[PDB]
Structure formats: structure tokens, C-alpha cells
Amino acid sequence: DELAKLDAFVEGVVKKVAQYMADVLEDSKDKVQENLLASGVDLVTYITRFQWDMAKYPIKQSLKNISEIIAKGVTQIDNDLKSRASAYNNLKGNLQNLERKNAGSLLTR
């Protein structure tokens, strides 16, 4: 049960940090997909050649302890994305609002 819930969270986080990278890069899905990578190789290569990363997620921990390591790491990334995305989006929003006041009526320009 627990891993089945946890997977449906980490998939959500991976999709958020990829979706937001397309928005920050502004252009197109293909140009982003060309640069979706793990360890410096494309997703197909990484999933095909998987070897367990026992520096990060140690093999001799209990299955419950490994679960909590992976949950804490992905939780931190979800939080730090939220902060970094808020902080950058505000600049873009406010700068467009100044352009909307270079534009607009003589009554508000």
C-alpha cells in the first residue's frame, strides 16, 4: 500500500519539475524532451541500464527505512521547486504588468 501511494506522489513531483522546466524555457515540448536526462544520459538509456545507487539509498537499511529516505528527498525537491518557481514567476508577472502600462489607454499609461 505505502509504496503504491508513494509512487503516485513521486510521479507527480517528476511531472511538476519537468512541466515547469518547459514553461521556464518557453519554447516547445520536443526541445525540452531532447534535454530530459538522468545522470547525463537519455531516459531510455538510464532505465535500460539501471544499477541500484547504494551511495544514496543504502541496501542494508530495512525496506521501511529505504522508503523514508526516498520520500524525504523527493519531498524536499517538491518544496524547493515551489519556492524557486514562485520567486522567478513574480519577476515575469510584474515585468509584463509594466509592459501592460507602456501599452493601454492614455487614461492609465
Binding site: 547504494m54 551511495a55 544514496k56 543504502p58 542494508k60 529516505i69 528527498g73
Partner: protein, 170 residues
């Protein structure tokens, strides 16, 4: 590109460049905040634990001895009291000898970090420690330990701390 610290009295742009290139993906691009410094918070191991007790992120130990040689460790978990070893294999020891060298985990055993009430130590493999510091942060020792397969981190196996900093990535 040289990373965004809030200060440092031990390190220099020679050391910050060479360190920022080695730290794990887990901290690449974070600003470095000073958690503890013997030169600002007063010199004791109880203070180093007390200042580290609120953290939940990696730290960089930096030491300067009475020969002015800089060395330390990057540690995946805060320095805290423990009855058993803790930390994970991204932990490493480093030394400016005067070349920058880094001794990443060998794969041999999981003896990364430990902390008694009266000393703090990193590494293992027999009676060996890669780094050991006393309750006063006065005496310390380094030997080759099989967790990292390090050289002697100081000029001498037994050293005296001139000053010490702990940075954290927050």
C-alpha cells in the same frame, strides 16, 4: 559560478572553487550558511552539537590546524550525538595538501559519522578513524581508515585545531 556564501574566515576563492565542483547534486546551486564557527560561537564540541541540532540537510566541516593546513569532511547528515554510526555514502573527506585531494567512500564499510558526548569521529576499519576531535575541539587525530582510504589529512597524525567552521546548504 563561485558559490554564494554568507561569509568565511578559513576558506578562500581557491578553496570555494575547488569545493563547489565536488559537492553532490543534492546541494549544487544552494547558498552556504555558517552553522558554527570556533572563531565566532566559542570553542566547544557541546556548542557544535547544540548549533547543529536544528538542521536537516548536509554540512561541510572545515578545519585549520596549527600548521595552517585546511582539511575536513562533507557529511550528509548533521553532527549529532549517537550510540552507533550514521550517514550515507555520499560523505567524503578532503584536504588541501597543498593540492586539493578528495577521498570518496571506498565501498568497504558504512562507518561514516559517529559522535559521543566527548568526541566526534568520521571513518572506521579497526581502531582507525579518518578524523577524530576531542570534547574541547583542541586535540584531534587522523589515520588511514578503510571507509575512505584517506591519506593523513593534516601534516601530522596528531594535530591541534587552530580554528573550525561548519557550513550548511540552506
Amino acid at each position: 559560478l563561485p558559490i554564494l556564501q554568507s561569509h568565511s574566515a578559513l576558506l578562500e576563492n581557491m578553496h570555494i572553487e575547488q569545493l563547489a565542483r565536488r559537492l553532490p547534486a543534492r546541494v549544487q546551486g544552494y547558498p552556504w550558511r555558517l552553522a558554527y564557527s570556533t572563531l565566532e560561537h566559542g570553542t566547544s564540541l557541546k556548542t557544535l552539537y547544540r548549533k547543529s541540532a536544528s538542521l536537516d540537510s548536509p554540512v561541510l566541516l572545515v578545519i585549520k590546524d596549527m600548521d595552517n593546513q585546511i582539511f575536513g569532511a562533507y557529511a550528509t547528515h548533521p553532527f549529532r550525538f549517537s550510540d552507533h554510526y550514521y550517514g550515507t555514502g555520499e560523505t567524503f573527506l578532503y584536504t588541501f595538501s597543498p593540492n586539493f585531494k578528495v577521498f570518496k567512500w571506498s565501498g568497504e564499510n558504512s562507518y561514516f559519522i559517529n559522535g559521543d558526548i566527548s568526541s566526534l569521529e568520521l571513518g572506521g576499519g579497526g581502531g582507525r578513524f579518518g578524523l577524530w576531535l576531542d570534547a574541547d575541539l583542541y586535540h584531534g587525530r587522523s589515520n588511514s581508515c578503510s571507509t575512505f582510504n584517506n591519506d593523513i589529512l593534516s601534516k601530522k597524525e596528531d594535530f591541534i585545531v587552530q580554528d573550525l567552521e561548519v557550513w550548511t546548504f540552506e
